[PDB]
Structures are given as structure tokens and as C-alpha cells.
Design an enzyme around this catalytic site. Structure first.
Site, mmCIF file in Angstrom:
data_model
loop_
_atom_site.group_PDB
_atom_site.id
_atom_site.type_symbol
_atom_site.label_atom_id
_atom_site.label_comp_id
_atom_site.label_asym_id
_atom_site.label_seq_id
_atom_site.Cartn_x
_atom_site.Cartn_y
_atom_site.Cartn_z
ATOM 1 N N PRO A 186 0.837 -1.164 0.026
ATOM 2 C CA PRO A 186 0.042 -0.005 -0.050
ATOM 3 C C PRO A 186 0.792 1.012 0.078
ATOM 4 O O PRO A 186 1.856 1.251 -0.065
ATOM 5 C CB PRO A 186 -0.761 -0.272 1.270
ATOM 6 C CG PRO A 186 0.414 -0.448 2.247
ATOM 7 C CD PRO A 186 1.304 -1.600 1.331
ATOM 8 N N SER A 187 0.205 2.160 0.052
ATOM 9 C CA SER A 187 0.890 3.573 0.118
ATOM 10 C C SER A 187 1.307 3.803 1.435
ATOM 11 O O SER A 187 0.908 3.443 2.462
ATOM 12 C CB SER A 187 -0.237 4.714 -0.087
ATOM 13 O OG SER A 187 0.292 5.980 0.542
ATOM 14 N N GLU A 235 13.013 3.075 -2.726
ATOM 15 C CA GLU A 235 13.766 2.024 -2.520
ATOM 16 C C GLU A 235 13.276 0.634 -3.035
ATOM 17 O O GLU A 235 14.263 -0.190 -3.652
ATOM 18 C CB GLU A 235 13.831 1.794 -1.014
ATOM 19 C CG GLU A 235 15.011 1.409 -0.135
ATOM 20 C CD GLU A 235 14.782 1.025 1.307
ATOM 21 O OE1 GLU A 235 14.827 -0.242 1.823
ATOM 22 O OE2 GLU A 235 14.331 1.982 1.883
ATOM 23 N N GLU A 270 -4.828 2.396 -12.893
ATOM 24 C CA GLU A 270 -5.933 3.450 -13.180
ATOM 25 C C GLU A 270 -5.223 4.650 -12.444
ATOM 26 O O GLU A 270 -4.650 4.915 -11.209
ATOM 27 C CB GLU A 270 -6.987 2.895 -11.887
ATOM 28 C CG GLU A 270 -7.678 1.592 -12.501
ATOM 29 C CD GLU A 270 -9.094 1.677 -13.090
ATOM 30 O OE1 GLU A 270 -9.678 0.879 -13.392
ATOM 31 O OE2 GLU A 270 -9.428 3.089 -13.518
ATOM 32 N N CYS A 321 -10.282 10.367 -7.941
ATOM 33 C CA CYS A 321 -9.823 9.815 -9.480
ATOM 34 C C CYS A 321 -11.144 10.272 -10.265
ATOM 35 O O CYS A 321 -11.012 10.256 -11.604
ATOM 36 C CB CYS A 321 -9.425 8.658 -9.697
ATOM 37 S SG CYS A 321 -8.224 8.010 -8.558
ATOM 38 N N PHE A 364 -6.452 17.316 -7.684
ATOM 39 C CA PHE A 364 -6.608 16.474 -6.575
ATOM 40 C C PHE A 364 -6.698 17.040 -5.317
ATOM 41 O O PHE A 364 -6.184 16.803 -4.354
ATOM 42 C CB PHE A 364 -5.407 15.271 -6.684
ATOM 43 C CG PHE A 364 -5.850 13.875 -6.643
ATOM 44 C CD1 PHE A 364 -6.406 13.190 -7.708
ATOM 45 C CD2 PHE A 364 -5.522 13.217 -5.571
ATOM 46 C CE1 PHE A 364 -7.036 11.965 -7.536
ATOM 47 C CE2 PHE A 364 -5.867 11.881 -5.395
ATOM 48 C CZ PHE A 364 -6.421 11.309 -6.615
#
Lengths: 492, 492, 492, 492
Positions: free
Chosen positions: B173-174, B207, B247, B281, B383
């Protein structure tokens, strides 16, 4: 044959006035030239396809199909000329030239027949007064990149679905085979393809290759060829997020179980290794034979391969390699296998032919024994009439050796055991598994593969559907005040 | 909270135990830590998923669906823990958090319901004793890469169909939202996902980013996030030809025709610009209003936008931006607009909050009048809660302006004219078109866009089918000698 | 013209040589004769189709499609002969005749294009070493029964998909229109339909009707015609459980909302009531007009209806009724209406023609005002140029009145309100709903209705799939001992 | 157990106060009564389903699925009670009772999982400003008629798809098995099925059978049972043109090729002949064994059949026949076979049991040798634990003997020859072909057959789709003047 460019409804020269020579693979001499399009020529082609798009789209699939069928009919009526261009440019035996044209005609028919059948969808919305409409529409501008090995067939494969589905096209064929592409384009133009819908560009990869794939207006790239070129394309197409249809290298395992019908296995292997001189994306590139029959199998395979005639298209069983580079690569490959201690059971060199044939790019059928699973001849695509053989004793071993490959296109299996058949249908991780029969692929199959073989696929409902983009329309017809959970109604 | 890695059936630390901090977008204070996977960690997760693959595949979709349903049930039962983590990690208003969890639950259900329903096909072969079987099988190892904006919803979106269809997964994940993803992962583990099938990796893009998408054994990458990252991925995945589901950005046009239901359009716009602070989005990113109603509409939209409260998740209409880099970047966007002469009708800066919230990454609603169609604020994704409006006067102009856009995801249309609704369904070249209603997208829609928005799509039959590869098996059961036109029968 | 039977590859006479006369609907004079098949003749045709079956099936859809395309080509080339036969047998205006032949050609193309595209399916079995293959195969012997109203179009509609999908056929047309059917049959024979595959039978319903639909060897019946005949068929086919495709009556509501384009609705109504003299399964059979526009609309519809010319096919707008039984029955309908107090606004009798045409079966446009919803003229099918109109005032009332109908085929709606269009798409319980346009139906639509209109449908993927039966093959390829929970393993 | 009726949301008595007795097949004594509904009771049920339809439809498939899943969960939680009703009413061995309930739960899950996935279609219209929308909607009122042999399973099979797709239901079970139907209905009511959506009627065929199928408001009849009853239904349903789903008799051939795995063939035959005492629509009803293994095969089959225990559900391998009529029919069948000169190798009578079992309807396993292909025991359904055996020597013979049957449901094939497998997949003209495995059918298969086996089918996407009606909406959004070829524009 001097081929030209076709840009926005007119046949034209390269704007640099430069050309590239075409060599005969049969004689080694120059027989033709093609125009070497510049980037500005490419920009003009792409702009023409952009400008023609809406009117091409608005015509509808049925009207577009009429033109495409018309092109098929003109091709069919004048097929001898195309068969002759293939023989001249590629050196194919006459029956291969004829078969490929048979495939051109079959494909165009098959794809045009999808008119008004690639339906969209209606789905339930989140209330009784909501629906979700799903339309299938063209992507827009298609760049079509065709290889030299099936230089007619691969043009029909890409143009017919792209066009039926309402995309406009810029076609760039291989520089080894401009003639067969040009001829097919001409027939589409004669069939009534409108101005700017179908564009034809030839030129050097090093001048225009990156440029045509990375161009800001391209919506979809459909390409067959080398793995390395497909990799570069995917890198460059990151500039436009073009939809990608790449069919790249193969390294088909050819598997002969102990209970195989020997004669059929051997007929199919002669075809799979030597058709188009092994210059096929589904060529037999590894041979695995059950140890109980390995020695008899190899003996007969070598004896049949000895009986193949090389030379002139009019009477050969097998033709030459496409160019001097293919010939040098193929020699280098055999010499590396030799220096590794592979045993050459037959072939492995260019023969010494006479007459004009002495300078063609002829290579002997080449069979290699007790080939290592991890050798270059087992792991790297050869694309020529060379194969190594290895013994197997079990089914799990066979599956594992076959899948231990960075490619994943075609594969072959001869056995009368129904359980190996059904199990391998899932265990053999390849796009195509041919069981007790040869290729080539059918128009109703989805020609694709796993791993390095590329992206998406061609043929079948699903292949033609790769040239359509699914879009959604969410409608609310309640005619009532909206209520949105996270927006306070007391603001109104 | 402190998050860990999940690799080959065990919660574990980073190979070196290095960690990354996590900041509250509401107070700017450190609130959490995650493990910084190493390249070796990624290898172990990918190797784990390779090993688990066959037994996961062999389990069948029905049995895999049972595990996924169980995960849904455990999620539903403990949902308040996930709602709280989204509020802490993202600062979303309580009703956005709750809604995102409703969607987690809805999606996991919808996708698990596909068990035994994604059929293969049987196609006619080239003779009465031939057939072509077309199996849909999993791609294999799926790398799932989720963004921070819907950090629970997006994890459900990718895991559920990837697992149902028999792929194994590595999820990264982020680094802005590790907690919501870990919590969901832990629910699948508690539901009995077998060892190796689902792996969880966190760490710095700089990384391990390229490493994970270029890895030799990855078969499929499913990613939502920024365009530039999706471009890099597409480049890197040329190393393995992984199937891509990307996406990326949107720049949704919000179009209000003269006959629009004003109240419903304004409601919908408040949702579409300000839901999740514009960090969506499918956020409204350009506003096109009919010249007859532009003045009244802009006037009302300003007054409404003034009434929205920013601050604590427990009582705000609108939350903060995810991180300080988002905040800097939003201010810069607004400054560029102000210095190109754009007219700010409302807002355009950080609000004035008390207490801990003054250190949070808040940004006011920002409305710009008479925007230029070619400006940054219309051509580049924001955004954030910023939008410019322009007058429109014809239907063809509306289509053209909408389509003059490097993005192609969502769009909004308010009108009571049927011929516009039907025509726009084709003329608006966007993946989603919301007519007289707001989003978000439904599980049954194919969430996708044109142009720079990416590759493939998610949702619907088609989206879940993206995690399946079609393969062909050609079978001949004539039981008779083969005849191959290019192979002489006199050799046999 | 004189027509014959076609049985097992030869044109032949009736077993006894009995014949039936044929009358011109334009002059009432005998113009033709057909053979009166006997029960023995039907047996021979059915036996012929039984014998031909396997070789026809084995030919494959591609090869069968080639024959069907050839028939289309021969039809297109000689189309004027078929146009003339329709004008003589039916009395249709020249532009109706031409149009019906255009549809013959369009349909034969559309259906032949399905070759190799109607796929079977593969479904997951109950273990990893099980699968369920689902093949679509032909039903076998198809009895095609065509009506007199579209006597060419309906023959193409049934033969083309029945033959493409690998069924053999026995065709029995209406004894009012044998010529158009024989001519088309002869074109398929000239195109090379193999012996036994297509059989042609004519004769009296009262002599061979039940016999042919109850026969032991019939696998599928495809019939269009009157409701009472379709009811009898369904009863008789209980003797063989033949798959039924029945297209029976319609009572189409024609609905004009207050915001309708008046000119377009009136155009469309002239078409929908008076095309083929109202002898259409989708003819406007009830007229519902919004109270705000009823008076102007009825007034205009009357004036327009006055201007339509009846008579010779070469120059009429409208032709005659098929036979004297149609004429009697139309007069009786009108008399019943006049004697229930209905208000005749125009027409209601035979026109006043000169010459041969005074003996033709002509009937004027007949418009009744303020019709009663429960009356015969609203509840029973007319199939003639007669319609009554009623005022409507709400959208729910419009749906309810439309739906209060024992038939359920076509319907027409004129409005510019999107919410009515979308809502009616579900609320109008009819097979076809034409919104702001006329019919007829397209080959890609699924021509079908609800309630008494019949069974199954024709056109689209779904219609041609009605001629295919789905069968399952369950395969276990575990190669291991079976375990069956209700069977004790201690017995083995 | 006294069962009642469920009409318009209330449990009620028959309005005549009359009842029918339920007998135990294990003991032969009365154990229950059911209400004998009148026609007025039926009318009330049907009117209730009519009145509930629109609100049931408007709820949407997802909301309907929640209720259906809820019913599944309550059934699963309390499954022992249902297993016990099956044992009591039918006499099934405990493992069969358990398996059938397993099937009830599996089916309900499988069908409810189709929520929001049975999509409609969008098709090209006849211009660029025309489309054809194809919606799938419920038929309306479904009459569901379930047989006694799988009295739980067959209820789940019919209710779950009918309900998911938005139809309302009137269920009438077999009078031999009201208890298991009532229990399942009760669970649907407890799950929240709204008033009038699900109705439950029991009564005598001779009083209400014709009445419920011919009723003016019925839209669809879904029935499993006897061939003769299906024939009458099809006759009576001509009154309303109800969509028909009939699964009727079977006469499955069981084919054992010379290379068959004997043990597996024999396990599967024990199951196929003796499961539910041969009271199955897919029971082995003819045995064909290759002459090379016929004598050893029959010897072992007789020896295994000798080892089957009859009697009490708690410990029997096989249970009794449903009623005294089934017992008298089965004796009569065996005595006719005897009087024809069939040789009885084992069984052929009711055993003399003690305790309460002496009056149950027990019949011995019965194997008949050198049975004539044209005898009653080969041509007529038996539905009891009796089978005849016949030798075969070739594949064409095997296919011909198998297809020489007025039934066409299931069939079985044991062989290791892949060519017989693939060829028979088309040559065996039966709805289900089981290859190297037992039944029963899976929820994802399309349970259907050829010839007298009935109409349409159940299971798979296609089976659930039989409860949906496809409708078409043709829209024109050109916004321009219409031009209709056969209507003069100079009228305007």
C-alpha cells in the site's frame, strides 16, 4: 517492385526522397526499393487518421463491413499476384504462399462478420430508477506494426479487426517485406476505404520506430515481432498509455508421450519445425520425447528431414531465411551449441547451391541431440530450422520442463492418455496447446501467450474486442430530489 | 499504530528492521510507524506467492470464495476499527469513512459472488473431429499497489478479484496509509487465507518501487495512483511483460446544460469537488456551465461552498489534504492560476483553524471564474478542492471541450434533453459519464478511462476477468492419419 | 405461377397430385396453383431431413455459411423476380415489396455471419481434476411455418439461422403465399444445399397441420402466425416436446405524450397503422394521445389518412387485404364497433375503385374516436387498417393502459422527456418499444413479446441461439479411485 | 406433521376444510396430513403474487439476494430438522438426506450470487443516432411444481432463481412430500420474503392441477416430474402462453467400454442405479458393457448389489419406494420383463422384512440379463432399482443404441480412449454425459435434455436466465425530421 507511402488518401514519396533496398532471400540480389518515410511523413499519416476518425466511426460497423468484404473479394479475385509477391519477397514454397493467402481471405471474412455483434451491456444501477449503460466504442488511432514472417497474413490480422470496430489505422510493415503489405493496402483503397482511414508508412526502425509508437495522438498499438522490439514499444508507449497488443517471441515445446501415434507425431513435427523454415511464432523449438520411443522417434525424424528439398519456391519443401542477418544469427547459434558439446545429428550449416541460389540465405534442417534443458538452444528463440531433443520419463517432469521457459506461446502434445490431455490443458502454461494435431492457429482462437510472449491477443471474439474500449453511462431518471449521504440537505 | 510485514504465513519485521514514520493529516504529528521492506523481503513475498500458487489454484473458486466471504464477515463485524483507522490516517469526515467501509464490504461480496461463473469457451475447430477449448486461468503472481486516497476501498478492489480468480498476491500500500491495508490483510489471514497466498509489504517507493514491478516472477500488476508512477511502471514491466491494470489520473468535466435541475446539479457538484477534499480519481476538475445559467449557478455554488466546515472528522463536511507535499502543491497550483490572471471568486488558501488543526494540511474550497480552456488548472490534475468554471453555448462545443483533455476517466452531465444524453453517451470520450447523478462508481461498472488514465479497468464482469488469462487447447480426435497440405504424404 | 414440392433433393408433385388454388388479392382472380402435400409427403420430407442431418452437422458452420451466402448472392442478383411475386401474391406497394426483399438479403447475411461465433462454454467442475464442457449443438429437424403477411421476409428469418446452426429443415409456407417461399427455396437449392437438408411442403392446414407439428421426429418448430394456430401447435407438440419458437399476435399501443414531435409521430403512425394494410405483427393497434394535443393530433391524422391512395402495387400507398376472409372479418370488426356506439371519424368501408380492383380485397383507413379501453377494437387484434384513439393524462395511466393487454409484442412512444423514456423501458411490458421512431425490427434485435404473443424470439445472438441446444459433458481426469459419499469404500 | 397453506402472507387452512393423508414409505402408516387447497385458494395465491410483483421487482436483485442469502443461513443453521423431515417423508438413508440438504444450501448460494450479473445488452441501431437497448426483466408470476424424489432440492432449485430474478411465486409440491417444501417456505418467510411474493399451495392434482397451470395470470411454469404430467401441462398452458421449464423423464444409458477402469465404473453404477432407490431423473436405466468384459463386469455388479442393505434411514444403503403405487408399478414392470423371457440375475421382488418395516414399500435391487433393446425395460422409464444389461462390440453401435431412446437426459461413459470421449461429446445426444464419474448434476451445469425430456433447463447462467424475458428498446435521438421510405414526405 518499388513500393510507395499512402498518406491521407494519396500515394506519395518519402519527403526526404530516401529509400531502402529489398533483397531476394532466394537469390541474394536487390529486387525492389521502398520509401524511407520521415517523422513529418509519420505526423501527416497520424493527423490524417485523427481527422478521418469521427466520420469512420459514424458510418457504423455494418457499412464498414461492406468495404472490408469488398476488399476481401478483390484480394480473392487477384490472389495469384499476392502469392507471387510472397514468393518473391520471402522465398516461401508455393503451397505456403497459397496457404497464407488462404489465411488472409479467411481472416478478413471472419473479422468483418462481427458487424453489429460485439454488443455492449446494460447493468442494474443503485436504485430502481438508475441504470448503467456500457458501450463498446473504438479506441481511435491504431498503429499497426507487422513482422516479415507472415507478411500478408499479419496485415490482414491487424487491419480487419481494427477497421471493423471503427478505428483508423497507420500501418508500418517490416522493411524486409513492404510489397505484400502495400498490395493489401491498395486493395482496401480500391474497396472504398475513405481518405485518411488507412495509412501506409514504410521506413527504418532507427528513424521512425520510437517516433510512431510514442506519438501523442496514438491510442492503440498492435504489433507482432521480436521480444526486444515489444519491450521497447511498451517503454515508449508509456508516453501515451496506448492500449497494447503485442505478440512477441515463442519457444514452443513439442512433447511426444510414449503412447503417441508416431506417424502423426512425426508429420506434425515436420510441419512444426520446417514450415516457413522455422520462422514462425509457433514453431517447434524444443523436442521432448518419452525415453521408451526416443531412439526410434529421432531416427525417423532425421530420415524424414533428410528427404526435405530446399531451394526454389516452385518445387522446394522449404525455403530460405529472410536475410543475411538471420543467416549469420542462425550459424552463430549452431556454433555456440556445438562449442557447448551438443551433438549435431543432421544439418547445421548452409548448403552450397548452384545458379542464382548460391547467394540465397539457405540453411539446412538441423537436429541436435542430448541438448541441455538450460542451454541457449533450449532457452532462447531460434526462429530457424534448428531444434534440440531431450528425453523425458514422466508427466510432472514434462510439465515442469515445458514451463521452464521465459516464453509461453504455443506447445504441442502427442498422447492417447485422456488424463494427460485434460490435465495438461491446465498444467501446460501456454497460450496454445496443440493436441494430436499441427497448427497454425484458427481465426476463432485467441492467439496469445504467457510470460514474455506479450500483451493481450488476436482472434476470437476476445481478440477483436481488444480494439474496443468499454465505457459506462450512469443514469438517474427518478425525477426526484437527490440525497447524497455526505452532503447536508439543509444547505438547500 | 505500528504495522509489520506479512510474508509466507507469518507477521515479521523488515529484514533489517528499518521503519518509516506516519503523520496525521489532521494535526501534523507522528502517529504511527511501518516496516521498510527490503529487496530481500520482496523476494521472499514473491517466492511465497509462487509456491502457494498451485494449491490455491487447485482449491477452486468456490472454496476460495468461502475464505473471502469469511473475511467480509469478520470485516463487517469489526468495521468500527477500520472506520477509525481511515479517520486517523486520512482525516476523512466520519460519514466518508463509514461509506468507504460500506464499499469495502460491498466490493468483497460482489467479487466473491463470481465463483464458478467466469466461464471459458468452446469453439468449433477446423473439422468435425476438432475443437478449440478456451480456458480462463489465473495469471499467477499479482502485485497490488494501492493509493492513499481510498486506502481501504482500493485494497478490497484489488484483493477480492485477484484472490477469487486463483491468483496469489503481494500487496504494497501507500506509505501514507499502511494501517487500513494491514487491518484488512489481517482480516483475510483470520478468515483462513493459506500461507503464501496473500503477502503484505510496506516500504519506500524509492527503495523497492521499481524492484517489485520489474521482478522476474510477477505475472500481473494492478495499481491505482499518479500518472507519472503508472508511466514508470509500464516502462519497468517491459522486463516481465506483466499484464497491467493501471488506474491513473482524471480531469473530469462537470457539464451543466441550460435545462439542468439546478438544485440537483449543485448538490452533485458539492459532492464531486469536495468529497475527500477533491482527492478522488473522479473529482469534478473542470466546470462547464451553459451561458443562460452560468451567473446564477456560480453564485449559488460560491454561497454553498462558503457554508462547508473544515476540521475534525467527527463534525466536518470536508477533511484535510493527505500530507504536507499535497498542501505545498495545491498552494503552488493556486499561485500559478492567480499569476496567470485567473479570477478567484472564493477561497484559495488554508483556512483559519484553532488548536491542533492549524498544523493539519487543510485547504479551503477554491473557485475560479471564467477559466481558460488551455490553462494548467484545466489541463493538469489538481486532486484538491479547487476548480475553475467556463461558459458554454453549444452541444458540439461541450463535447469538444470535454474531450480536449489528456485524461479520460469520469465526467458529469446535467440536462433534461434526451438527445443530448444519448448522443453524449458516445460523443463524450470518457470511461464514466454520470448523468443527472453523482458518483462514486458501482462494483458492477467497469471503472476505466481513455487516454492517460491507464490500462484495462476494475469492476463488472470485465474488470474481474482482467485477472484471468484465456488459453486455447486445440484437439483433434479424428483418430485418422493427419494430412497437412505443405507436408508430402509420399514421405509416409 | 405453379408451385411444387421439394423433397429429398428433387422437385416432385403431391403423392396424389391434388392441388390448391391461389387468388390475387388485387383482382380476386385465380393466378396460381400449388401442390397439396399428403401425410405421406410430410413423412418423406421429415425422413429426408433426418438422413441428411449428420452430414449437414458435420459440414461445420463455416461451410454451411458458404452455401447460405451463395443463396443470398443469387437472391440479390435476381431480386426483381422476388419483388414481382410478392406484388402479385400480396398486392403490396412496389416500395413495400422492394423493402421486404432488402430484408430478406439483410437477414440472410446477418445470420450467416454467426459462423463459428456461437460458442459453447467451459465451467469449473467439483474438483481441480473435473470440468463441465457445455456444447451448443443443433436440435435436429426443424419445421418452419411461415405466415402470408411477410411471405419472403419470414422465410429468410427462419431458414437462415436454422440452417446456419446445423439443423435440417422442412418448410411449409402459408397457402396464401406459396410462390415467394418456393422461389427462395429454389435459390438455396441452386446455391448447393445438399439433398435432404431443406425440404419444401405446401398443403392445407386442415389436412396436414396437426400432423406436421405432432410428428415423432420433429425436434424444433419455428412458426409465426395467428394466436389460435400457435395455441393448437403448443398442444400438438406435447406429443414430441419439440422446442417452440412461436411469434403470434400483437396489439401494439401507440403512445404520444404532450411534448411529442407531432410531425414525426404522425409520420410514424401512418407507417405503423397502414404499412402492409395494417397486416403486421407490430402494427399500431391502439392510439393513446395526451389530452393537451389529442384534438389537433386526431384532426391531422384524419386529413393525412384521407390522402393515402389504395390500388395498384405500381402506384398505391396502401395495398389490399390478403383474402376474402380477411375482408369479411375486417367489415365485421367495424360493424361490431359501430354497433357498440363507437364514433367513426373516417372511413370504415371498402373504397370505391374502378376496373379489376373493385374485385380486390381493399379496405379504407378507419379511425375511431374516443375508444373504450375494454372494447373489442382495443382488446382483440385487427390486422387491418383500423384503429381507435383515447385520451391519456398521466404517465402511470399510460403504462397501465398499455399493459392491460393480452398481447405483448411491439409498442410506440413519442416524447422528449428522458425520465419517461428510461422508466418506460421497464414499465412498458412489451417485447419491443420504439421510441421516437418507427419499426420494423432490425436483425440484431430479439423480436419477441410477453403474454399471448408466444414463445422464445427471433433475431440477435439470442434468437439464432434458440436453434441450438446446450448439452453438458462432465469429465473426471483425476485418474484416482472414485469416492462417493453414499457408496461404501469397504465394498472395494 | 400437519402442513398448511401460505397465501398472501398468512398461514391458512384449505377453504373446503379438506386434507390429504401422508404415508411413511418406511412403515406404511399415516404420519401426517396436508391441506387440500381449492381453486379459490389457488386464485387467492395467484392474485397475491400479482399484487406483490411490482414492489418485488423494484427492490432490485441485490436487495432480493440479501433475503435469499438470509434464508440460506437459517436453513443451514437448522439443517438437522430438514434432514429429518426428508428421512421421515421419503425414507432416504441419512447420508442421502444430508447430501440433498447440502444441495439445497449450495443451490441457494449459487443462484443468489447472480445478483446484478445477468446483464442486458446494447446493440447498434440502423443509424449513428439510433441504438437498441436490450433489458432482461422478470416474467411475472411463476408457478413452481416440484416432484417427490428430491423434495427439498427441487424446491431450492426453482424458488432461488425465480426469486432472485424478480418473479413472484406460487409453489405446489408433490402431495407425497409436503413437509420438506413447507419447511423451506417457512424459512424464506422468516428471512423476510414480503407478503404475496412466495405462496404455498398443496392439494390434489385432479382438483387443482389443470387449474393452476392454465390460469389467466400465470407467466411461467417451472416443473419437474413425470412425462405424462409435463405433456398435459404443455397442453393446458396454451391458454396463457406461459414460458415453460419442464424436466421430465429420463432413461440414462450407462456405457462401459472395454478399457474402462472397472472399479470406478462399478462404484459409479452402484451409485447411479441405487441412489434414492433408482428414483432419480438421471438414474442408470440401461447398462451396456463391452463384450470383452461383460461377464466379469456383471458378476461383480451382482456381488456388490448383494451387499447393499435396505431398511431404516439410520443404517441402510438404500431406502424404500415412495408409495404403494410405485411398488405395484415396479412389480408389474418386473413381471412383464419376466413374461417376455428376460433372465433375472438378482432381485425382482419386495423382501419380507420384520417389525414396522414389513409394511414399507421396499423393493430389492434387480438386475436383468440379455435384455432386448426394444423391450419395455429398455424403452420405458422405470424409476426404481431395476436395470437390464446388454452387450456391445463397437463405438457406432454404442452411440446408436444409446440414442435409440425417446428420453434424453443423462448418460454415463467409462473409457480411457480420448477419441471416444471427444466424439461421444457430440455423438451422444443427451443433455448430460458423465465421463469416468458419477452424478448428480452441479449448480453451474445446465440440467436439460433432448427429446421427451422436456423444455428449457435449470442451472448455470442459462438456467437462471430462463426466468428472465429479454425486451428491446429502439431509440432514435437524431433530433431531425424522420424519413420513412414507404410514406410520402409531400404529405407534410
Amino acid at each position: 517492385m518499388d513500393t510507395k507511402l499512402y498518406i491521407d488518401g494519396q500515394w506519395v514519396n518519402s519527403s526526404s526522397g530516401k529509400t531502402v533496398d529489398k533483397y531476394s532471400p532466394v537469390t541474394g540480389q536487390v529486387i525492389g526499393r521502398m520509401e524511407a518515410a520521415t517523422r513529418d511523413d509519420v505526423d501527416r499519416a497520424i493527423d490524417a487518421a485523427e481527422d478521418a476518425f469521427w466520420a469512420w466511426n459514424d458510418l457504423g460497423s455494418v457499412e464498414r463491413s461492406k468495404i472490408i468484404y469488398r476488399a476481401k473479394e478483390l484480394i480473392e479475385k487477384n490472389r495469384a499476384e499476392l502469392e507471387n509477391i510472397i514468393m518473391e519477397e520471402n522465398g516461401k514454397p508455393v503451397k505456403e504462399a497459397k496457404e497464407e493467402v488462404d489465411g488472409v481471405i479467411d481472416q478478413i471474412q471472419y473479422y468483418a462478420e462481427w458487424a453489429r455483434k460485439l454488443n455492449g451491456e446494460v447493468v442494474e444501477g443503485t436504485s430502481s430508477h438508475r441504470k448503467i449503460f456500457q458501450y463498446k466504442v473504438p479506441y481511435g488511432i491504431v498503429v499497426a506494426l507487422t513482422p516479415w514472417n507472415f507478411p500478408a497474413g499479419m496485415v490482414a490480422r491487424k487491419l480487419a479487426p481494427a477497421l471493423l470496430t471503427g478505428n483508423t489505422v497507420v500501418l508500418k510493415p517490416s522493411s524486409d517485406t513492404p510489397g505484400s503489405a502495400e498490395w493489401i493496402v491498395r486493395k482496401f483503397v480500391e474497396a472504398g476505404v475513405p481518405k485518411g482511414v488507412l495509412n501506409f508508412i514504410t521506413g527504418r526502425g532507427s528513424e521512425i520506430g520510437d517516433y510512431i509508437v510514442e506519438h501523442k495522438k496514438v491510442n492503440l498499438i498492435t504489433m507482432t515481432g521480436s521480444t526486444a522490439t515489444g519491450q521497447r514499444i511498451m517503454q515508449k508507449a508509456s508516453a501515451n498509455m496506448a492500449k497494447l497488443i503485442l505478440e512477441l517471441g515463442g519457444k514452443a515445446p513439442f512433447m511426444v508421450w510414449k503412447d503417441a501415434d508416431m506417424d502423426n507425431a512425426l508429420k506434425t513435427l515436420l510441419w512444426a519445425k520446417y514450415w516457413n523454415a522455422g520462422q514462425s511464432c509457433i514453431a517447434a523449438e524444443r523436442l521432448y520425447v518419452h525415453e521408451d520411443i526416443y531412439d526410434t522417434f529421432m531416427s525417423r525424424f532425421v530420415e524424414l528431414s533428410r528427404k526435405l528439398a530446399l531451394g526454389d519456391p516452385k518445387n522446394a519443401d522449404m525455403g530460405p531465411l529472410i536475410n543475411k542477418g538471420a543467416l549469420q544469427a542462425t550459424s552463430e547459434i549452431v556454433e555456440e551449441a556445438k562449442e557447448s558439446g551438443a551433438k549435431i545429428l543432421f544439418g547445421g550449416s548452409q548448403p552450397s547451391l548452384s545458379g542464382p541460389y548460391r547467394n540465397g540465405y539457405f540453411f539446412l534442417p538441423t537436429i541436435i541431440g542430448n541438448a541441455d534443458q538450460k542451454s541457449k538452444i533450449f532457452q532462447e528463440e531460434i526462429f530457424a530450422p534448428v531444434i534440440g531433443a531431450r528425453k523425458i520419463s514422466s508427466v510432472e517432469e514434462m510439465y515442469d520442463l515445458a514451463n521452464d521457459n521465459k516464453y509461453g506461446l504455443a506447445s504441442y502434445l502427442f498422447t492417447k492418455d485422456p488424463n494427460i490431455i485434460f490435465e495438461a490443458s491446465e498444467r501446460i502454461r501456454f497460450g496454445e496447446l496443440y493436441v494430436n494435431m499441427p497448427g497454425p492457429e484458427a481465426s476463432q482462437g485467441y492467439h496469445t501467450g504467457f510470460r514474455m510472449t506479450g500483451q493481450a491477443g488476436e482472434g476470437s471474439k476476445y481478440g477483436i474486442s481488444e480494439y474496443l474500449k468499454l465505457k459506462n453511462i450512469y443514469v438517474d431518471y427518478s425525477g426526484k430530489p437527490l440525497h447524497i449521504n455526505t452532503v447536508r440537505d439543509d444547505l438547500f
